[PDB]
Amino acid sequence: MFTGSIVAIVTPMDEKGNVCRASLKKLIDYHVASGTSAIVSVGTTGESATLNHDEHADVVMMTLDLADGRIPVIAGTGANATAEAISLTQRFNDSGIVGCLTVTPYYNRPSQEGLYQHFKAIAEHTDLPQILYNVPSHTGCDLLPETVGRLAKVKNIIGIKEATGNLTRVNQIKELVSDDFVLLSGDDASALDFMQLGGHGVISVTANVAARDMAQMCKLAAEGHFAEARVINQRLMPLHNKLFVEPNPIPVKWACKELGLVATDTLRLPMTPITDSGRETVRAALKHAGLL
Amino acid sequence: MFTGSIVAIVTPMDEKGNVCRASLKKLIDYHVASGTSAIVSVGTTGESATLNHDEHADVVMMTLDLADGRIPVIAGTGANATAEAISLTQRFNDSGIVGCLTVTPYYNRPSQEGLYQHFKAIAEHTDLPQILYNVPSHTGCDLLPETVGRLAKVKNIIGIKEATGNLTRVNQIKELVSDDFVLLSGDDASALDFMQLGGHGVISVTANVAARDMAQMCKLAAEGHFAEARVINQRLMPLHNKLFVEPNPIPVKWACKELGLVATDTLRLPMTPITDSGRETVRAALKHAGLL
Amino acid sequence: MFTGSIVAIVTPMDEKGNVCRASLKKLIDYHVASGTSAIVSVGTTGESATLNHDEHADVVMMTLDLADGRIPVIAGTGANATAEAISLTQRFNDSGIVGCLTVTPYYNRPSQEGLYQHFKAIAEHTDLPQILYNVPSHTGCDLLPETVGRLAKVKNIIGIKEATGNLTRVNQIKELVSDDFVLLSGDDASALDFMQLGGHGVISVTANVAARDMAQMCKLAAEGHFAEARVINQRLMPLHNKLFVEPNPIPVKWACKELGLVATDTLRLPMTPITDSGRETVRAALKHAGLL
Amino acid sequence: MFTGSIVAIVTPMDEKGNVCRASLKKLIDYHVASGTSAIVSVGTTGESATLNHDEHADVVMMTLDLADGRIPVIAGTGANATAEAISLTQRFNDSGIVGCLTVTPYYNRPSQEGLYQHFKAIAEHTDLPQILYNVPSHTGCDLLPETVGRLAKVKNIIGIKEATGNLTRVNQIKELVSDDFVLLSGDDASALDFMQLGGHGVISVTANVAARDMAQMCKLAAEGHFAEARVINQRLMPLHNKLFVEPNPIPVKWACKELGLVATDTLRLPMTPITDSGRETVRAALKHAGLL
Ligand SMILES: [K+]
Ligand SMILES: [K+]
Ligand SMILES: [K+]
Ligand SMILES: [K+]
Known part of the structure; x- marks a missing residue:
């Protein structure tokens, strides 16, 4: 609830820039299945800056509903x-x-x-x-x-x-x-x-696309098994870094789409679509983590 | 007008944190009389962060009304x-x-x-x-x-x-x-x-309390008289620095109150009142500028 | 030898700025008695910058002699x-x-x-x-x-x-x-x-004046007893910080003199004697560590 | 003379890292002919760090001898x-x-x-x-x-x-x-x-390879003709930046060799030869300056 691997979850959008309910459901199911400890709804990674308070609240309430008591x-x-x-x-x-x-x-x-x-x-x-x-x-x-x-x-x-x-x-x-x-x-x-x-x-942020690994890493850490955890961390380190190759959450939203977790990687201005170079950079980090 | 000395004007508030029309009028008369080129209304120094869009708009409209065509x-x-x-x-x-x-x-x-x-x-x-x-x-x-x-x-x-x-x-x-x-x-x-x-x-920000000197300094600079302008700048330099001794606009609002330009030095949270040490620093800078 | 608490030892000087053999002997005995793992001779803290290579070598050879196989x-x-x-x-x-x-x-x-x-x-x-x-x-x-x-x-x-x-x-x-x-x-x-x-x-650097505590802290750390070690670290933290209140090794040389470990706190230019304010700052950190 | 364009001159070396008198002579003739105000001998760009005091002195004395009263x-x-x-x-x-x-x-x-x-x-x-x-x-x-x-x-x-x-x-x-x-x-x-x-x-540093332009730019600046000086500065700007693409004086020595001003671009460790990428960057900057 306030320990372990907590995801700063993306706010998946349709091409029009509005929350995509099907994609959000898919993400939440994925985190329940993955052993993610909790969800942070409409934080920085969730584009709190470009959502008005009404939209912000709708996203939180929708996430709560979809979570259906299965994850805090x-x-x-x-x-x-x-x-x-x-x-x-x-x-x-x-x-x-x-x-x-x-x-x-x-x-x-x-x-x-x-x-x-x-x-x-x-x-x-x-x-x-x-x-x-x-x-x-x-x-x-x-x-x-x-x-x-x-x-x-x-x-x-x-x-x-x-x-x-x-x-x-x-x-x-x-x-x-x-x-x-x-x-x-x-x-x-x-x-x-x-x-x-x-x-x-x-x-x-990494937990958005490597939820199982992240949950596993934090479990090992909590149990004091740091050498075992570092093996996972090393596998994930390129994502830890390259998910900020361009401004968050541009890379992680693209990674979600690429893994089929969300329908579109659409963001709101002033966030802009990932560059070609960014794609290949993030794709390589996903490959290194064994996810693509 | 987009040259010379332009003031990033404070939004003067009563003790409830609401815009004080009477203080604002005084400030605007002061800038008309002191040769200020233009007024920036509800910029950073005007506490844009803690005013909602309605209040923001009200201040600008009130500023335009009070200015009455005498200053852009x-x-x-x-x-x-x-x-x-x-x-x-x-x-x-x-x-x-x-x-x-x-x-x-x-x-x-x-x-x-x-x-x-x-x-x-x-x-x-x-x-x-x-x-x-x-x-x-x-x-x-x-x-x-x-x-x-x-x-x-x-x-x-x-x-x-x-x-x-x-x-x-x-x-x-x-x-x-x-x-x-x-x-x-x-x-x-x-x-x-x-x-x-x-x-x-x-x-x-300095132009809030040293409007005439700033107007003159900027005019001299535009005319290429940098040595003459710099004598003014030297008197103003303590103010240039110490108006940020605590977060802007805390020091400059206090200075405006001390000069009698505004009724109160009240701000909205998360801005807090000036410390005693800050009062002394800013007051010494005002005296160095020949304003007290 | 290359683990535990290793002292970056000061080069104690007489009033003329030359190595003080009696003070160096006193320091080395203190580190042998204190359980210091090894001595670094003429590092940064030992004023490598202001000693010529001949003087540098004399200090190292003298330290080796005085150590007499009792400490690396x-x-x-x-x-x-x-x-x-x-x-x-x-x-x-x-x-x-x-x-x-x-x-x-x-x-x-x-x-x-x-x-x-x-x-x-x-x-x-x-x-x-x-x-x-x-x-x-x-x-x-x-x-x-x-x-x-x-x-x-x-x-x-x-x-x-x-x-x-x-x-x-x-x-x-x-x-x-x-x-x-x-x-x-x-x-x-x-x-x-x-x-x-x-x-x-x-x-x-701290080990120069708190050798026993430092040695004890590093032993606990090596054994995984970090909570116990933190108690020592907390007692020493003001020295960890304030021994750089003025440029190293000005503070630590003064601290040595104050604890009676060296005869004089003399340094070579461009290092200068500790200020009065520095004295009181370092004295308070020594007091906090329970050494004065 | 302590005004205008003063060159922080390279210490040109043969392949054994020893001062090359013939290259140094060439550089000095070049600066006399190009209107350089003075020469800084064995500064940072002259590899002061890796010359001993005897060699340092030799270079200065050799520089004075070769200059023969024609340049300070x-x-x-x-x-x-x-x-x-x-x-x-x-x-x-x-x-x-x-x-x-x-x-x-x-x-x-x-x-x-x-x-x-x-x-x-x-x-x-x-x-x-x-x-x-x-x-x-x-x-x-x-x-x-x-x-x-x-x-x-x-x-x-x-x-x-x-x-x-x-x-x-x-x-x-x-x-x-x-x-x-x-x-x-x-x-x-x-x-x-x-x-x-x-x-x-x-x-x-730029004056090593763009001596005439630097002399002219500095004279114009002294006369207050900043717009005219700035046209020269714009041509030189790539060089101003890219002469530090790798540690100084690696790029500028290579540039001197490429122009035929010195026989070799040899430095002393820990300076190492320019990379191929560096060659291309510096060469492009030289062409932008109209030197190649
Ligand atoms: K609490
Ligand atoms: K335009
Ligand atoms: K090795
Ligand atoms: K002088």
């Missing part, structure tokens, strides 16, 4: 305005989602005090578990360990998706929070390392 | 979803604004091709002049000179607010575009250097 | 000219040192091919074990894992001191080299993490 | 140990050189106070004019404008080669120093911008 669903609820983050969060109160993934405000670059006040206010307007999400290369700001420790004192703030790729954060945060605060990687290429350092899992 | 108004119209950017632009058709300031999509990190398609689509569906806006430290992406060159060929894409603070961009862009394409600094601390290299003005 | 000694042998690195290395052939610590050429920024040719040539002129040393913030270049794997095929190239602070390097290098290739941290603040990821020890 | 010679005298820098400077007293180019200590990363004491001590023990040299990407340290300001008060510290490529440094330094303190670019790609902001010339 976490809604993406991040916003760079606190009032807006509260409003979006309130849409999913009493919905059936098990928690929220809420990113540090992007673009307006709040202070550490501002981040504290932002997340505290959000948590105070919901009973839903809150997972913080730090990704400075996308947001322009960096939620530091000290502020994480401060927020972890709030009752329903229960974990962090740490996507810096800076592995020193694991033990910097861990020593500042209680033993049941969840530490999740948001960086596929360093996620096994993250887990070896004491992390509890990964919210993953 | 440019609307912030940027969005990280192309469809949203387009529809926000439609709100201002035949409103009376002279142009739009439109930022590179933030948070979703489109490719150069994606940025091209984004701005081309926006420009397609309006007659309004478009000023591109690059600020990688806030957005997570960087509109490179090559792409600015491609976009400058679009009839109503007329200029760029370049806020990297990387001065090599001035002539990299200039050689790729026509002589009437406007190059504007979005980094106060390097804006005079920017103009000396060939830039045509600045979209300024 | 590794000579610093790095140089940014390959011929110069060979010459320096040859001075210690048949000396009694157990190996060499050789840094990537600094200042002239060689390619990965250049680094390969540099280290290969050096290794070919000695029977002594060679430990590569990567520290891009000091050298201006970065020896990447792929090139490390390539060099690890050379018989007497047996390990790396990895001082990037980038923990992803551990498993990137490990998968490219044989199981007996040694992986050592060159970054005190991340060294336990480094070991938890599969590293075999640390070449340490 | 500046000696590279930088070292990361103050004592070494001082004694290297003494080798050139009454040699006939007009000044020294002395880099910030590399690898040992002194503080600003350390840099101050370093250069002050060097300047104390000579009558020769001293040109400071800042290049953080190579040295690991950054001589900031404040410290340049302090150092400029020393009688015979007369200028700075600023190689950050950060153009804000021009006027940050200029406002802290006297009007006759010389500001020279050490970054070819931004050198014209640098001069347009107030800089007095460039110490150039």
